[PDB]
Amino acid sequence: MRCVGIGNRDFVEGLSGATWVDVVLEHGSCVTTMAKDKPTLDIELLKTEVTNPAVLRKLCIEAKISNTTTDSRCPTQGEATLVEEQDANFVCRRTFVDRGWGNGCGLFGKGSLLTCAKFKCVTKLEGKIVQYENLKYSVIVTVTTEHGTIATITPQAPTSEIQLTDYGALTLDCSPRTGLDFNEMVLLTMKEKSWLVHKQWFLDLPLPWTSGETWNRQDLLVTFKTAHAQEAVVLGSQEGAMHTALTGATEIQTSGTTTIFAGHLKCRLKMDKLTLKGISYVMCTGSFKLEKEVAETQHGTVLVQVKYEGTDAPCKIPFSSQDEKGVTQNGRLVTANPIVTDKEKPVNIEAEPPFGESYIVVGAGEKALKLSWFKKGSS
Amino acid sequence: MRCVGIGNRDFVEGLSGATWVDVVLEHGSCVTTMAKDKPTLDIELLKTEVTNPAVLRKLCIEAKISNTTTDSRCPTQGEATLVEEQDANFVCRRTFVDRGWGNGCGLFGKGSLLTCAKFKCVTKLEGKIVQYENLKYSVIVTVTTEHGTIATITPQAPTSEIQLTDYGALTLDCSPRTGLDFNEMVLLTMKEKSWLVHKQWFLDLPLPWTSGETWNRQDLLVTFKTAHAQEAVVLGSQEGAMHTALTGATEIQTSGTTTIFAGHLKCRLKMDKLTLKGISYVMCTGSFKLEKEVAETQHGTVLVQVKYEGTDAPCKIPFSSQDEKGVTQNGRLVTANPIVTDKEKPVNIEAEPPFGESYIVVGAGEKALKLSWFKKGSS
Amino acid sequence: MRCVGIGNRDFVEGLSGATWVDVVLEHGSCVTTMAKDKPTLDIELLKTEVTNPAVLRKLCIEAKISNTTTDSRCPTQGEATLVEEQDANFVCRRTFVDRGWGNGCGLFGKGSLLTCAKFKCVTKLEGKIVQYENLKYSVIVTVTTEHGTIATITPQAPTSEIQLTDYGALTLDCSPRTGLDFNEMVLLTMKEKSWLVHKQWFLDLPLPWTSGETWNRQDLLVTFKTAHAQEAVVLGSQEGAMHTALTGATEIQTSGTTTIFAGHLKCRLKMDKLTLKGISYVMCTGSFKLEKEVAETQHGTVLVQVKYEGTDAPCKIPFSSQDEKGVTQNGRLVTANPIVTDKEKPVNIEAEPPFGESYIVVGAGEKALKLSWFKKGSS
Numbered sequence A, B, C: 001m002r003c004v005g006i007g008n009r010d011f012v013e014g015l016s017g018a019t020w021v022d023v024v025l026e027h028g029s030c031v032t033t034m035a036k037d038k039p040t041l042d043i044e045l046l047k048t049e050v051t052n053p054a055v056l057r058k059l060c061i062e063a064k065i066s067n068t069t070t071d072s073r074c075p076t077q078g079e080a081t082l083v084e085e086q087d088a089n090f091v092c093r094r095t096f097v098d099r100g101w102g103n104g105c106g107l108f109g110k111g112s113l114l115t116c117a118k119f120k121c122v123t124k125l126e127g128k129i130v131q132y133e134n135l136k137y138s139v140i141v142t143v144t145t146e147h148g149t150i151a152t153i154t155p156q157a158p159t160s161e162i163q164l165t166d167y168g169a170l171t172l173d174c175s176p177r178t179g180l181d182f183n184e185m186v187l188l189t190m191k192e193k194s195w196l197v198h199k200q201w202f203l204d205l206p207l208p209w210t211s212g213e214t215w216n217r218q219d220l221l222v223t224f225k226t227a228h229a230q231e232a233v234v235l236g237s238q239e240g241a242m243h244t245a246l247t248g249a250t251e252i253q254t255s256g257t258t259t260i261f262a263g264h265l266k267c268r269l270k271m272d273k274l275t276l277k278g279i280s281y282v283m284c285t286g287s288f289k290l291e292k293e294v295a296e297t298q299h300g301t302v303l304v305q306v307k308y309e310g311t312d313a314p315c316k317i318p319f320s321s322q323d324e325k326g327v328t329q330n331g332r333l334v335t336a337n338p339i340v341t342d343k344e345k346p347v348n349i350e351a352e353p354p355f356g357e358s359y360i361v362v363g364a365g366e367k368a369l370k371l372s373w374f375k376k377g378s379s
C-alpha cells in the first residue's frame, strides 16, 4: 500500500485526558496510525485552494477613444471651454495654438484651445487579494482502505471534530505551515492566465486603473500631439508589453474563482485517551537515483525527486545540506520526515536551501547524491 | 449557574511534568473545570480591545482659503511671480491671460499671470493602524463564584502565570484565533464615528492628505477658474460625500483611543501535574427556535442565536452545513463546542459559511432548523 | 555555571508516545535540563538574523544633470520640439517665452520653447523588505559543558531533528515570539547606515524613485526657472536633509546583506518517552539594585537590568506592573521566567509596559525597586 505511519515521538498519552498527536500533512502525502485491535487510520490532505478573492485594483491595458470634440478661440477670446472638463470619462488637453487668417481669425497671435475624447477601456487586467475568507484546506480522515470523511478547514475556523467509528470523537486542529504571504502577493489575471506577483510591483505598473465607472491617469495611454489651426495618439494592446514584463513571475493554474495550491498543513488530533502505535523507520542504505531534476516551488522551497534502489522499504531517508563554505546546517528540510514506503514510488523532498551555492546530499555512505543548487533573493 | 466545563479530550496529564489543557475562550463565553476536592475553576475572556493606534494618514475633507494674492504681467514682461510659490501652504495657479487697453496695458497680447492662496484645512479625517503594541486581551481566572484574578495578555507577551490557591502556579498561554487582519484594515475616524476599511481603498480616496504642517494635492479641493484682466473655487464640506461612500463599511463603537472588539482567544494552561475532571455532554434532542435573525460578524463569521426547547441541559448542540450543491462540509464552525448550559439562555453559534448559497442546519431529527444564507466576496 | 533549568509545569511525559517539553529561548539566555544518569542538556539561541532582502524601492537623494539641450520657436512657428521628450532619461520643461528683435525674431509675441537634460542620480538610498526566505534562527543544542550541535531554523522550515547521544532522536519545533512586523517595516539603507522605518512613511518621501534604468518624478530635484530669449535648478545632496528626518528611527547594526536581531524564539522538543527533571526556583528575597537604566528595545519591549544582592541563587524574581491608575496588571512580562542563576551576573527583564505612566516593581517586600516609565504610540 501507500500511507506513512507516525513515529514514537509525536503523540502523547496522558494517564487522564487524552491522546494528542502531532501531524504535518503535506501536499501529496498521507499519514497513518492505529492502536490494538482497532482498525487503521489514514489522514490525508485533500487539497488547498483559494476561492472568490477581492478585486484590489483593476487596470486598463488597452482602451479606445470616442466622441472626440474640441473648442478653440482666437486671441482676445479667452480660454476655450467644454462641459466635458468635468466628466472623468474624457481625457482632455488644453494647449495654446496659433491663429492667423489661416483659419478665419482676423488678428495674429496665439489662441486658447481645448480638446476631449471619451476614454473607454476594452481590455482590463485584475490584481486580486487573498484573506482568510478565501482560504480552505480539504482534509480526509479515512479509517486496503475504505469509506473516508472530509473535513474542510480554514484560517478562520481551523477546529473540526469528527465522529470516527471504532475510535470515537476526534478533533482536528490545523494550521498552514509552508506557504505564501498573501499579505505581499497579489493574484494577477490577464485574459486566460493567472500570475502571482509582489503587491508593490503590481501597484506600480504604468497604466490607467480603478479601485476594484472611472479610470485614472487615463492619459498614460492617450495623448495629444501638435494641435493644428488637435489630435490624440495612443499606444497599442498591452498583452505583449506585459507578457515580457511578467517574465520572472510565478505562473498559476486557476479556474474561474477557484485557484489551487500545493498546501502544507500542520495539525494535532485530540482523541479519547488511547495507546496508539508508533513506528520508527530504519535509516536507509540503498542509494538514490535522481528521478527528475531539482525544481523550485511556488511556496518557496526546492523539490527534489529521488528514487531508492535498495531492499529496505520502509526506511528514513538520510539527507544533508551544506552552504558555500561547506558547513552542515542541520535543518532546511521542509519535508519533515521523508521515508521510503516502497521502492518504485519515487519520493519527494522539499527543502529550503540557503542563499548562494548550496550542496544537498541525499543518501548514506558512498553513492549518495550530491546536488549543487543556486539561490539569490529579490522582488 | 453559567459556565461550561472541559471535555475529555482537551487536556493531558503526564506521569511526570504536568497538566496541559487546551482552551478556546470566546467573546461572551466562560470555560470551567476542577479536580477532586479542589474548588471549581472559571476562565473567562474579559475583553478585547485596541488602544492608542498609530496615525497612518490624515486627510482633509474640508478646508478654507486665506490671504489670496496675485501678480500678473503684460506681454514682454515675462512670467508673473510670487515668493509664495515656495511655501506649501498656498495653492497657486499660473495661467496666461489677455491684456488690452482693457486693464492698463499698452499693447495687445497674452500676459503671464500667477495667483495664490493659503490653504487651511478645517475638518480632517484620520486613518489609523493597529500593531502589537496596541492589542490587549483581558482575561479572568476565577476559582456560586468568588474572587477572580485578571490576566492581561497581548500579542507581544502572551504568557501569564498566576498564583491560584488550592491549585498552585498556573501559566496561561494565549493567542487570538478568529479575527481581523489589521495588516489589511485601517481604522477610520470622521468626527464622532469610527469605521473600519480596507487599507488600499482608504489610501485611494481623492483628497488632500499628510503623513500622520503640510497638505498634499491640496488642489483636489481648491481650483482656479477663468482669470480676468483670477478666482479660485472649492467643493464643500465632505461629511456627506463620504457617509454615502463609507456605505458597505463595518461600523465600530470607539471611545477616545480605546476601541473594543468581540475577541476570540485560544490558550493552553500549564499547571502542576493534576487529574482534572472532563465532562462530555450528551448530544441534544429538543429542537431549536431561532431567537434573533442570522447576523454577520465583524470578525468575518456568521452568528446565529438559537433557543433550546427540551429537558436536556446540558447537551452538545448538533449542527451542520451544506453548500449550494448540498454537500455536508464538516467544519465551518467557529464556536468550537456549542452546548446548552441551561434552557432560557439562548445560545450563540458562530459559523463561517461558504461562498454562495449555504444551508445551515441546527438540531437532530425533524424539527431541526434549516437556514439559507448568502455569501459574495470583495473589498 | 551559567544556564537555567526547566520548571515542573512545562513538559509532559505520556504513558506512551513521548516527552514534549515547552521552551522559550530568548536573545541572551540558555535553557537547561536532564533525566536520571543522563548527561545534562543545554539549549541556546545562537542568533537571529535576516539575510539577502528584496529591494523594494530605490530612491535618488542626489543626482546630476547632463547634456542639456533646448529648442525654442518664434510666434507662428508652433511648438518647439525634441526627440528627447520620449526618453525617460531627461527631465524637460515646455514653457512659452517672449521673442522680440531681442533675439533674432522679426515679430513681437510669445514663442513656444522646450528644454531638456539627462537626469543621472549619483547617491541612491534603498528601502528593502523581509520575507520568510530571509529569516533564520541559529540554535544550539549542547549535551562544565562540551560539544554542541547547531540547528538552524526558519519561518519556512521550523522543524529540526537532531541526534543526541545518551538522549536519542530529538525534534525541535520553533516559532518566533516577540518581534517585528516586517509586513509594516522596511529596512532602510543610506550609505553606511541602516535604519528601520514604517513602510508607509518610507513610501511617501518626496523624491525621484524606481521599482527595485528609469527614475520617477525626477523633477522633485530638478527644476526650471524663468526662461530667457531656459535654466534648470536643483536642490543639494540629501544625506543631511534625511538624517534630520530619520530622527525618531530605530537604528540597526548591519553588514552587507546580513542583519542581526535580538531574537525571541519559542519551541517544543519532542523526544523519546522520558522522565525529565523539573526545578521550581525559590522566590527571591534579596533586594535588587538597578544596574543600567531602563532602555527601550527594538522588538518593542522595555529592558531593565537588575542586580541581586542576596544569598539565594537560584531564585524566581518577583516582579510587578501597575498602570497610571495604579492597577496591578498580571502580565506585560516578556521574559517569561526571570531567575537569579548566580549573583554577580546581572539579570535582564524584558517587559511590555502599558501606554501612559507605568509603574514597574521588582522585588519582594520593602527595598523593592519601583520604576516609573512613559509610553505614547505613533508612526
Ligand SMILES: [Cl-]
Pocket (backbone or CB within 6 Å): A075, A108, A109, A110, B108, B109, B110, C108, C109, C110
Ligand atoms: Cl500675440
